[PDB]
Write an enzyme that holds these catalytic residues in place. Structure first.
Site, mmCIF file in Angstrom:
data_model
loop_
_atom_site.group_PDB
_atom_site.id
_atom_site.type_symbol
_atom_site.label_atom_id
_atom_site.label_comp_id
_atom_site.label_asym_id
_atom_site.label_seq_id
_atom_site.Cartn_x
_atom_site.Cartn_y
_atom_site.Cartn_z
ATOM 1 N N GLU A 49 -31.192 17.051 -30.255
ATOM 2 C CA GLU A 49 -31.276 16.834 -31.689
ATOM 3 C C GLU A 49 -30.234 15.824 -32.333
ATOM 4 O O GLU A 49 -29.002 15.619 -33.202
ATOM 5 C CB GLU A 49 -29.850 18.364 -31.559
ATOM 6 N N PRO A 50 -31.001 15.243 -31.679
ATOM 7 C CA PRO A 50 -29.993 13.865 -33.151
ATOM 8 C C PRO A 50 -30.364 13.322 -34.402
ATOM 9 O O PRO A 50 -30.844 13.777 -35.217
ATOM 10 C CB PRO A 50 -31.031 12.560 -32.237
ATOM 11 N N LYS A 72 -29.610 18.703 -41.664
ATOM 12 C CA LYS A 72 -28.610 18.798 -42.164
ATOM 13 C C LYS A 72 -27.514 17.514 -42.640
ATOM 14 O O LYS A 72 -27.522 17.502 -43.388
ATOM 15 C CB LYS A 72 -27.646 19.709 -41.147
ATOM 16 N N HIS A 76 -23.330 20.334 -26.840
ATOM 17 C CA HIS A 76 -23.277 19.030 -28.065
ATOM 18 C C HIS A 76 -21.660 18.083 -28.653
ATOM 19 O O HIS A 76 -20.670 18.474 -27.974
ATOM 20 C CB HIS A 76 -23.386 19.722 -30.073
ATOM 21 N N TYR A 81 -25.019 11.706 -43.524
ATOM 22 C CA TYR A 81 -24.054 12.769 -43.893
ATOM 23 C C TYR A 81 -23.186 12.269 -44.997
ATOM 24 O O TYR A 81 -21.940 12.648 -45.523
ATOM 25 C CB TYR A 81 -22.518 13.359 -43.141
ATOM 26 N N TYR A 110 -15.227 14.759 -45.040
ATOM 27 C CA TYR A 110 -16.218 15.494 -44.215
ATOM 28 C C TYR A 110 -16.560 15.312 -42.651
ATOM 29 O O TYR A 110 -16.183 15.984 -42.067
ATOM 30 C CB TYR A 110 -17.466 16.305 -44.978
ATOM 31 N N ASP A 133 -10.818 12.795 -60.739
ATOM 32 C CA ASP A 133 -9.339 13.624 -60.131
ATOM 33 C C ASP A 133 -9.308 12.515 -59.461
ATOM 34 O O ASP A 133 -9.160 11.130 -58.712
ATOM 35 C CB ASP A 133 -10.374 13.942 -58.727
HETATM 36 C C1 PLP Z 1 -24.848 18.392 -36.334
HETATM 37 C C2 PLP Z 1 -25.034 18.835 -35.800
HETATM 38 C C3 PLP Z 1 -26.216 17.794 -34.309
HETATM 39 C C4 PLP Z 1 -26.588 16.311 -35.580
HETATM 40 O O1 PLP Z 1 -25.176 15.691 -35.242
HETATM 41 P P1 PLP Z 1 -25.223 14.297 -34.988
HETATM 42 O O2 PLP Z 1 -24.067 13.262 -34.575
HETATM 43 O O3 PLP Z 1 -25.915 13.922 -36.014
HETATM 44 O O4 PLP Z 1 -26.577 13.529 -33.948
HETATM 45 C C5 PLP Z 1 -26.894 17.999 -33.605
HETATM 46 N N1 PLP Z 1 -27.133 19.531 -32.938
HETATM 47 C C6 PLP Z 1 -26.114 20.206 -33.735
HETATM 48 C C7 PLP Z 1 -25.836 21.458 -33.014
HETATM 49 C C8 PLP Z 1 -24.715 20.425 -34.837
HETATM 50 O O5 PLP Z 1 -24.127 20.885 -35.591
#
Ligand code: PLP
Ligand code: PLP
Lengths: 403, 399
Positions: free
Chosen positions: A268-269, A63, A191, A370, A312, A342
């Protein structure tokens, strides 16, 4: 351009390529905003991760930046992928990544998307609620579930309403309910998040995760999977640097999750991999002088585009001059605005800049995370083109990772 | 109902049926299946109703629809048949309007701060009328669109609008550069609380018109901008605003002067035409008893209006709850993994369940136009409906 990658010659850096492109369009009006994305920087980040966190397998959080080039480079590196939706799973699998390198780390999934994951062999998913267990029992009964536990962020803007994460007390009931439903729970995830001032927070999370592991053992589960989430910084322009965090994480992992236990540790980086790889160049498209002398600059990217991260992602952006400023040049109070009609499309309320002109460029470093992932085409303005670059040595390094 | 691509597919709305009935039908159709994606019902007849209402309330003012508010091709096609103008801010918006067949004299390029290449695109495609509020903009126009007809955008009670003092200098500078200035525009904005702000803006425009006459310009175009409400769910209603605008227009810009008056409504045309249905995809109970509902549209999608447009959203049930039904404090969240993806912090709702639908009215304006596909979640399907009588009304507008 998505699959187009350019060579980065020896003795050049992403900055030099950016300067060259700027010079080349100097005598024309083709001055759309553009990114330079150094895929070699992503490889560098991977080497740094392997060195700093040798026991932790990285699962890139798609994401953060879903660029096909990024995902292909990381897939060649053999990292895992954290996917939150059907589209992300499709993207990762289309590049050839097998399902066992995918974690569906969204705790609150629509039934049809759980079904899509099951149909495509993605077995591992996170959860933090009983209703999620009901949905899994109905739609993906053979899934391997990872319990997401709450982590406190004392600097969050909304500390009473936390979107994800079970408390320890709730975690016990969830484990028992999963046992009742014959659903396999294989681990725990947490997280900490990017807004992390103190690395000890990770220690606390690891300690809490160990507690939930013990709970799983009590209920009869065979728990092996520890997921330490994301939030690691993606640039050196932060107070708390990556290596300080990892220096505090590794002893905690050794203490609470020793290797002999059989635990598999993943993370999960997202921003860590990509933040510094992207540099954004915007053009000053309009200018106003307000009378001592102050300036309003309008650039061709804004809060509806790359700078949505200001709202965001709580981002603070630093404009950088493409052309170096002399020590004697006068600086004026200035504001920087986006292209849309805007009144809220303002990038910088106040900063000090030398007098700039229409056609001059402003650079924003560390724009990988992001930014483009959340851009819109509001008012009809298209997304900036991304130019992907990679040196020969970086390509060779990627080849080594592929073998 | 099923889309036959939604952009150009329009469904019939039978006699005695409303957008709500179509929404109920679609919900009933998918009740026994897991295809519960969020969707819109967009009543193009409501837009035609708005146009008729505009013609009656502001008979001297030609509306130029602000495409940025909702760039749906179906909307632009309906309004183009209606013979309205279009306010376009960029090459892509001009391309969209011209693709549907609208000639350039029905387009105003009402962006005061335009990239040079965008000005060039407008000149290349015959769009002559553009706004401006700065000297640098005049320099760019002199180079890239020297025959443009410029409309001076004035300030009203930070990003756009020249003061009267600056307006004088801009008019003189435009005269030096042999650039034709033909009028004045202003934008009060939607958050307007007092309609008297319009009176002052019209008075200021009259002053700038007089300034133009002093330097030799023939000023004829008055653009009173947008900000008119798109629903009845506002304190200051459309007809109250127009009741204050029309006497001011007659006082400061009488018809015998030869003035041509236009406006740039965006949300007025489209806000109430779109109703959004989202499905509850996940649910949490927090212990007296409170609930957290997760729906499949969020702040990165249609509800970006919460942050970008200062929107206040009201969730509605499909069926009106009984008077003695138990209500619980509840929060509503978007589908993305972002902790900030929260639609409703706190509201009172009966206990709802996964698979139930929540409805959001007046979701036409500044919702889909600014949605992204963050986290891979796709934009909700839009089902366009129009009754036979609405089509008949469109025919009358067209002819
Ligand atoms: C957004 C997210 C991430 C990534 O976060 P970073 O700050 O980009 O490392 C990892 N795990 C989960 C569950 C997230 O929602
Ligand atoms: C956004 C905008 C409009 C339309 O505003 P609404 O509130 O949707 O009516 C009109 N004119 C200008 C100059 C605008 O920027």
């Amino acid at each position: 351009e998505e699959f187009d990658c350019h060579f980065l010659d020896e003795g050049f850096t992403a900055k030099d390529i950016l300067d060259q492109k700027i010079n080349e369009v100097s005598s024309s009006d083709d001055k759309d905003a553009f990114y330079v994305a150094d895929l070699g920087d992503i490889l560098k980040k991977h080497l740094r991760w392997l060195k700093a966190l040798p026991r932790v397998t990285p699962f890139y959080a798609v994401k953060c930046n879903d660029s096909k080039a990024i995902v292909k480079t990381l897939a060649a590196t053999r990292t895992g992928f954290d996917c939150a939706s059907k589209t992300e799973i499709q993207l990762v699998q289309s590049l050839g990544v097998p399902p066992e390198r995918i974690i569906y780390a969204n705790p609150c999934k629509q039934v049809s998307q759980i079904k899509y994951a099951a149909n495509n062999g993605v077995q591992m998913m996170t959860f933090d609620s009983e209703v999620e267990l009901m949905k899994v029992a109905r739609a993906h009964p053979k899934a391997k579930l990872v319990l997401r536990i709450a982590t406190d962020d004392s600097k969050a803007v909304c500390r009473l309403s936390v979107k994800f994460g079970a408390t320890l007390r709730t975690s016990r009931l969830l484990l028992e309910r999963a046992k009742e439903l014959n659903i396999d729970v294989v681990g725990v995830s947490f997280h900490v998040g990017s807004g992390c001032t103190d690395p000890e927070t990770f220690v606390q999370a690891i300690s809490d995760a160990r507690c939930v592991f013990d709970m799983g053992a009590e209920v009869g589960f065979s728990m092996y999977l520890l997921d330490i989430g994301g939030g690691f910084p993606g640039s050196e322009d932060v107070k708390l640097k990556f290596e300080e965090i990892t220096g505090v994480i590794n002893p905690a992992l050794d203490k609470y999750f020793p290797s002999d236990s059989g635990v598999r540790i993943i993370a999960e980086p997202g921003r860590y991999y990509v933040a510094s790889a992207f540099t954004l160049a915007v053009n000053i498209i309009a200018k106003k002088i307000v009378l001592e002398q102050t300036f309003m600059y309008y650039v061709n990217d804004g809060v509806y585009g790359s700078f949505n991260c200001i709202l965001y992602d709580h981002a603070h952006v630093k404009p950088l001059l493409q052309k170096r400023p002399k020590p004697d040049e006068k600086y004026y109070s200035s504001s920087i605005w986006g292209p849309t009609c805007d009144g809220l499309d303002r990038i910088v309320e106040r900063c000090d800049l030398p007098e700039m002109h229409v056609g001059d460029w402003m650079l924003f470093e560390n724009m990988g995370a992001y930014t483009v992932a959340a851009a819109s085409t509001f008012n009809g303005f298209q997304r900036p083109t991304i130019y992907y670059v990679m040196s020969g040595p970086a390509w060779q390094l990627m080849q080594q990772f592929q073998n």
